[PDB]
From a paper:
Mammalian AP endonuclease 1 ([name]) initiates repair of abasic (apurinic/apyrimidinic) sites and other toxic and mutagenic DNA lesions and performs critical roles in base excision repair (BER) and single strand break repair (SSBR). [name] hydrolytically cleaves phosphodiester bonds at abasic sites, which arise through spontaneous rupture of the N-glycosyl bond (depurination) or by the activity of DNA glycosylases, which initiate BER. In addition to its AP endonuclease activity, the exonuclease activity of [name] processes BER intermediates generated by bifunctional DNA glycosylases and removes 3´-blocking groups arising at strand breaks.
S6 Fig New structure of apo human [name] with a focus on the remote binding pocket. (b) The same view of a model that was refined using the same diffraction data but with a resolution cutoff of 1.40 Å. The figure shows no significant change in electron density relative to that observed for the model refined with a resolution cutoff of 1.25 Å. Superposition of the structures for these apo forms of human [name] (wild-type and C138A) indicates that the overall conformations are very similar, with RMSD values of 0.100 Å for backbone Cα atoms and 0.247 Å for all non-hydrogen atoms, with minor structural differences in the remote binding pocket near C138. A superposition of our new structure for apo-[name] and a prior structure of Mg2+-bound [name] illustrates that binding of Mg2+ causes substantial conformational changes in [name], most near the Mg2+ site, as expected. The Mg2+-induced NMR shift perturbations reflect these conformational changes, in addition to changes in the chemical environment near the Mg2+-binding site.
Residue numbers in the entry: 36 to 123, 125 to 318
């Protein structure tokens, strides 16, 4: 049947590097679902990272065993503190966190054994905030994993509420849901597909309410359509901007005065997701 979507333009606004208080950004975090660490490195992802020059780089879907890291990661001197979590298994899921400065503490998982076996979460505590990066479980073809995803969602929200009770929290990564209709090009056709089910959208709303957390991009750009971070490799989707916003920076409300900008690096190639970048004046 005929596809209804042609190209929809989206030009990410210029980087706002000053907070509403006037304070210059001091922290630049980039998050990227890389669709396989080795594949992404061959597609020059590290060249892009070096130009972006973030203080912290969070990666999802590394698909790479913690004992099989590419040597090309050794040539990242500005991101020398590198932490990885991969399934306890090989070649799927997996996250990484690479940092210019050394975190006070690094932890893996959410403290719930059922949910900690698939290499999905790294927690890096710094002086003024705690950073979590996550690759949230996909609801699956035919929604066969939606029940598990709902259990994950509840355990993850409870875990994050606990962290944020002690230190301001930044959550980033691939949360595997487009929260609202503005967050994907085809809401009408996807309400029964992974990433846009009512259960997943409600889970995201529950996450924002319960921790609580604010969606940094949507806070700054509440009415901006066509801003996506993922496009299927098939069906010419990226060229038409038939996409989904699956990648987020969620922030404790106390960090909103420090929020300078939340960017979507639409033009950066190397995966079926693009990078997102957060500027904070901490």
């Amino acid at each position: 049947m005929a596809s209804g979507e042609g190209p929809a333009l989206y030009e990410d606004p210029p980087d706002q590097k000053t907070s509403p208080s006037g304070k210059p950004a001091t922290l630049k975090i980039c998050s990227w679902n890389v669709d396989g660490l080795r594949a992404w490195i061959k597609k020059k992802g590290l060249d892009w990272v070096k130009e972006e020059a973030p203080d912290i780089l969070c990666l999802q879907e590394t698909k790479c065993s913690e004992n099989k890291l590419p040597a090309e990661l050794q040539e990242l001197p500005g991101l020398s503190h590198q932490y990885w979590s991969a399934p306890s298994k090989e070649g799927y899921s997996g996250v990484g966190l690479l940092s210019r400065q050394c975190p006070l503490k690094v932890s893996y998982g959410i403290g719930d054994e059922e949910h900690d076996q698939e290499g999905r979460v790294i927690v890096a505590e710094f002086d003024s905030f705690v950073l979590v990066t996550a690759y949230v479980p996909n609801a699956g073809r035919g929604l066969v994993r939606l029940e598990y995803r709902q259990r994950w969602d509840e355990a993850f929200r409870k875990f994050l509420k606990g962290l944020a009770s002690r230190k301001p929290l930044v959550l980033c990564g691939d949360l595997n849901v487009a929260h609202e209709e503005i967050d994907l090009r085809n809401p009408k056709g996807n309400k029964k597909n992974a990433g846009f089910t009512p259960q997943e959208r409600q889970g995201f709303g529950e996450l924002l309410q319960a921790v609580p957390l604010a969606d940094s991009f949507r806070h700054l750009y509440p009415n901006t359509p066509y801003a996506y971070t993922f496009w299927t490799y098939m069906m010419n989707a990226r060229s038409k901007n038939v996409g989904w916003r699956l990648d987020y920076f969620l922030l404790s409300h106390s960090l909103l005065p420090a929020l300078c900008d939340s960017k979507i690096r639409s033009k950066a190639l190397g995966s079926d997701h693009c990078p997102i970048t957060l500027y904070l004046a901490l």
